[PDB]
Design a protein around this ligand. Sequence first.
Ligand SMILES: *[C@@H]1O[C@H](CO)[C@@H](O[C@H]2O[C@H](CO)[C@@H](O)[C@H](O)[C@H]2NC(C)=O)[C@H](O)[C@H]1NC(C)=O
Ligand SMILES: *[C@@H]1O[C@H](CO)[C@@H](O)[C@H](O)[C@H]1NC(C)=O
Ligand SMILES: *[C@@H]1O[C@H](CO)[C@@H](O)[C@H](O)[C@H]1NC(C)=O
Lengths: 182, 213
Amino acid sequence: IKEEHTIIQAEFYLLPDKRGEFMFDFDGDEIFHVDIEKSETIWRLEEFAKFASFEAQGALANIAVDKANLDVMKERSNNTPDANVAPEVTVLSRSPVNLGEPNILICFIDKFSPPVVNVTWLRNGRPVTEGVSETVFLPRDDHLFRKFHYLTFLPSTDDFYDCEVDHWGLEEPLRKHWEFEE
Amino acid sequence: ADLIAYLKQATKGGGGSLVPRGSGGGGSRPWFLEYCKSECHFYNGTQRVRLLVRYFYNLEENLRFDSDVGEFRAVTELGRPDAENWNSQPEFLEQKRAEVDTVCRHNYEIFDNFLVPRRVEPTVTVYPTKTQPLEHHNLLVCSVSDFYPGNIEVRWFRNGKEEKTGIVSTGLVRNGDWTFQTLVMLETVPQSGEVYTCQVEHPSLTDPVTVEW
Ligand SMILES: *[C@@H]1O[C@H](CO)[C@@H](O[C@H]2O[C@H](CO)[C@@H](O)[C@H](O)[C@H]2NC(C)=O)[C@H](O)[C@H]1NC(C)=O
Ligand SMILES: *[C@@H]1O[C@H](CO)[C@@H](O)[C@H](O)[C@H]1NC(C)=O
Ligand SMILES: *[C@@H]1O[C@H](CO)[C@@H](O)[C@H](O)[C@H]1NC(C)=O
């Protein structure tokens, strides 16, 4: 045997949005992240909660330093900005699609920065705001980000779905398309 | 529930200013990002461990701390100041170097209780999927979904003869919720005299899952 694994402590602070983030990653998946504002630990899977604990204050403290560092970086680079990098959007079902059998739709947003976006699900061209959830900004090997948006749904021939992603590095919103296929 | 440790973030110092280095914007909304990844690399559990901290500013990685080196190393000039500021702090260096134990190893131990041992069995199902004119290459689809960890072998066998060509896959696909899925298709023209088998091997299983068609 031999256990090769990688744990990452990803964190950042962004301006002007003023958004911060602190999360841990295991072999590519999120273990948990902290709700900076509500100052609390959110586990990716509920079960993880009874096997450990993390002091959310720890994250806030860090984000403080991070926030500050950003200013030195801006003062050191004479506030020179960079381009924005638009995401690749992909939509696939979490499991094999069987009619009338409840499945999930995954909108995969990847290779992008800054770490911000506006995502919207469309069930027959109608925005969906129920049965949806999203992950926070996830680390990649390089310097970019990836994310996940989920949409609970019931497979039916009469239906078609769309995942709309907007990012500053895009002219017009990207609207990927998923429609039941047998 | 045992507490998970983390790497305390170090403060950078103002002062210097680098000639306008990397340009960018061309109209795009000006953004400024301070981003840092502290990576714990386990080459074999806590046996071999390498801590790797990487600092980024916007789109460029500029500062680094490879525990094998024990010091901060600039990747681009943007981060040298910090390299110099922190490496001259004998105090700080010790604190960092030790985090490979007080944090990496510390946390792994915990994580070895529910993450490392995690096991979700795959679900295998074969099936054809294309219009019926057959004006393509009747793609035989072998779907192995809802499994964890990623490590998995999905082989195709045409009449006991492993198809080592014409195998079109999506590769491993991460679902974001601690589960994977994959599609290993096989281009071929079906015949009631040939038997294509899809073998699936993976840590959760005990015996390769064999499905026929
Ligand atoms: C990786 O480190 C492990 C320790 O976690 C080593 O131990 C494993 O293998 C030993 C023999 O090689 C066994 O005696 C152990 O039971 C087994 N794990 C345990 C419980 O310690 C292992 O040798 C190392 N592997 C490599 C590739 O060096
Ligand atoms: C910093 O950039 C501004 C424009 O964004 C420029 O006018 C200014 O001269 C720069 N600062 C210096 C003098 O280095
Ligand atoms: C995203 O939406 C916010 C408001 O919710 C808006 O301020 C911002 O301009 C949008 N960003 C884009 C254009 O992607």
